[PDB]
């Protein structure tokens, strides 16, 4: 029935406003747009410009030195070869082309990490939730940022997934031609998730569901390639920041499958580590 995605100001939520609507939204949709949270369009454009500058003008030997060694370990570039190029970062072990790149992207990652902790902190407070060990130890974690860029201009459809994250924050730049790759299931339909001025998009992931004892939905979503007719003017970017728990974070396996999550393992409990390793 209900297929819209709400918008909230983070400062207002922190200010105690809109408590009932926020709780409903988490339980029933697990996704929303967010303003006033310490992220800006301008910070995104600059980070984006630098990486595109490198894509276009970095030499062959420079490009190889920052290309990721093994895709398992998720750092450096992919697809620079001179669909899409990709740049990934974590809290350490990062690969940078230059000093200014390192500074701008370190700052961008820090702000994004900070915005994500603040959002997660709000999700836990609205569901009256205290993870074991405390909120702060839990949010001081092992996050990952992935920035994708689709150049071509100025195919297999994959199945919707949920994210293996406490929270995921998504910023994007729009397509000239109006095309929207990001879609989620809300109330039984597939809804578009476009660029919205001065808003970051937020998804709750499975970890949010687990940590709140089922009070938050993790929405299924997929990103779609353009069809042949909608290729002209389909260049775009996204920045995706996964707030992932520490490897030693633990959960009840009754609970996990009871929520509908493919779990290989068995027993009373497990870690996040073995749930992907
Ligand atoms: Fe995803």
Give residues with Cβ within 8 angstroms of 230, minimum separation 6: 177, 179
CA 31 to ligand 1 centroid distance, Å? 12
Does the domain at 1-277 match CATH 2.60.120.330? Answer given as yes
CA of 223 relative to ligand 1 center, distance in Å:
8
- Burial group, residue 183, by CB count within 10 angstroms (0-12, 13-18, 19+): middle
Residues 6+ apart with CB under 8 A from 208: 30, 120, 123, 165, 166, 167, 216, 218
Q: Give residues with Cβ within 8 angstroms of 145, minimum separation 6.
A: 88, 89, 90, 108, 109, 112, 239, 240, 241, 242
Distance separating alpha carbons of residues 54 and 151, to the nearest angstrom: 13
Q: What gap in Å lies between CA 245 and CA 263, rounded to an integer?
A: 17
Measured in angstroms, how far is the CA atom of residue 108 from the centroid of ligand 1?
20
Which residues are the active-site residues?
A: 74
Complete edge-to-edge strand list for the sheet that includes strand 31-35? 7-9, 31-35, 200-204, 167-173, 236-243, 144-150, 85-89, 76-78
| Distance from the alpha carbon of residue 163 to the mean position of ligand 1, in angstroms | 5
Our CA dihedral for 57, 61, 66, 70, rounded to 10 degrees, sits at: 130
Dist. CA 149–CA 173, nearest whole Å: 10
242 Cα: distance to centroid of ligand 1 (angstroms): 9
Pair of tokens at residue 6: 């709400």
Burial of 101 (0-12, 13-18, 19+ CB in 10 A): middle
- If you measure from the C-alpha of residue 199 to the centroid of ligand 1, how many angstroms do you get, rounded to a whole number? 18
Give resolution in angstroms.
2.5
Taking the C-alpha atoms of residue 189 and residue 246, their distance in angstroms, rounded to an integer, is 33
Residue 143 CA to ligand 1 centre (angstroms): 14
Query: How far away, in angstroms, is 170 Cα from ligand 1 center?
Result: 10
Beta bridge partners of 85: 149
Q: How was this structure determined?
A: X-ray
Cα distance between residue 207 and residue 205, in whole Å: 5
What's the CA gap between 71 and 48, in Å, rounded?
22
Kindly report the number of other CB atoms within 10 A of residue 132's CB atom: 9
Q: Single out the residue of 180, 225, 150, 153 nearest to residue 5, CA to CA.
A: 180
Closest to 239 measured CA to CA, from 191, 207, 206, 201: 201
The answer to whether 89 and 145 are in contact (CB under 8 A) is: yes
- The Cα 172–Cα 168 span in angstroms is 13
- Determine the Cα–Cα distance for residues 206 and 127; give it in Å rounded to an integer: 15
Q: What is the 3-state secondary structure (H, E, C) of the chain?
A: CCCCCCEEEHHHHHCCCCHHHHHHHHHHCCEEEEECCCCCHHHHHHHHHHHHHHHHHCCHHHHHHHECCCCCCCCEEECCCCCCEEEEECCCCCCCCCHHHHHHHHHHHHHHHHHHHHHHHHHHHHCCCCCCCCHHHHHCCCCEEEEEEECCCCCCCCCCECCCCCEEEEEEECCCCCCCCEEEEECCEEEECCCCCCCEEEEECHHHHHHCCCCCCCCCEEECCCCHHHCCCCCEEEEEEEECCCCCCEEEHHHHHHHCCCCCCCCCEEECCHHHC
CB 181 within 8 A of CB 236: yes
Distance between CA atoms of residues 147 and 44, nearest Å: 10
* Angstrom distances, CA of residue 163 to CA of 87, 146, 220, 250, 272: 19, 13, 8, 17, 13
List the one residue out of 275, 23, 239 whose CA is nearest residue 116.
239
Q: Rounded to whole angstroms, what are the CA distances from 209 to 100, 107, 216?
A: 39, 30, 5
The CA 57 to ligand 1 mean position distance, Å, reads 30
- Whole-angstrom CA distances from 211 to 164, 198, 204, 257 are 12, 29, 11, 14
* Chain-centre distance for alpha carbon 179: 20
């Amino acid at each position: 029935m209900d297929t819209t995605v709400p918008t909230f100001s983070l400062a207002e939520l922190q200010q105690g406003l809109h408590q009932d609507e926020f709780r409903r939204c988490l339980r029933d949709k697990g996704l929303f747009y967010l303003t006033d949270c310490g992220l800006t369009d301008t910070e995104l454009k600059s980070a984006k410009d630098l990486v595109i500058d490198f894509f276009e003008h970095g030499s062959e030997a420079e490009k190889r030195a920052v290309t990721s060694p093994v895709p398992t370990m998720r750092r450096g570039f992919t697809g620079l070869e001179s669909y899409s190029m990709c740049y990934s970062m974590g809290t350490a072990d990062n690969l940078f082309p230059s000093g200014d790149f390192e500074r701008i992207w370190t700052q961008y990652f820090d702000r994004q990490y900070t915005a994500s902790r603040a959002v997660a902190r709000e999700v836990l407070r609205a569901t009256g939730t205290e993870p074991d060990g405390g909120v702060e130890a839990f949010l001081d974690c092992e996050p990952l940022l992935r920035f994708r860029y689709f150049p071509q201009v100025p195919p297999l459809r994959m199945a919707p997934h949920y994210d293996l994250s406490m929270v995921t924050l998504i910023q994007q730049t729009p397509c000239a031609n109006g095309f929207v790759s990001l879609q989620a299931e809300v109330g039984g339909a597939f809804t578009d998730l476009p660029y919205r001025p001065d808003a970051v998009l937020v998804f709750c992931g499975a970890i949010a569901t687990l940590v709140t004892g089922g009070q938050v939905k993790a929405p299924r979503h997929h990103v779609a390639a353009p069809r042949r007719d909608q290729i002209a003017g389909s260049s775009r970017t996204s920045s995706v920041f996964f707030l992932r728990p520490n490897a030693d974070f633990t959960f009840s396996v009754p609970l996990a499958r009871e929520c509908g999550f493919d779990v290989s393992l068995d027993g009373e409990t497990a870690t996040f580590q073995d749930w992907i390793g």
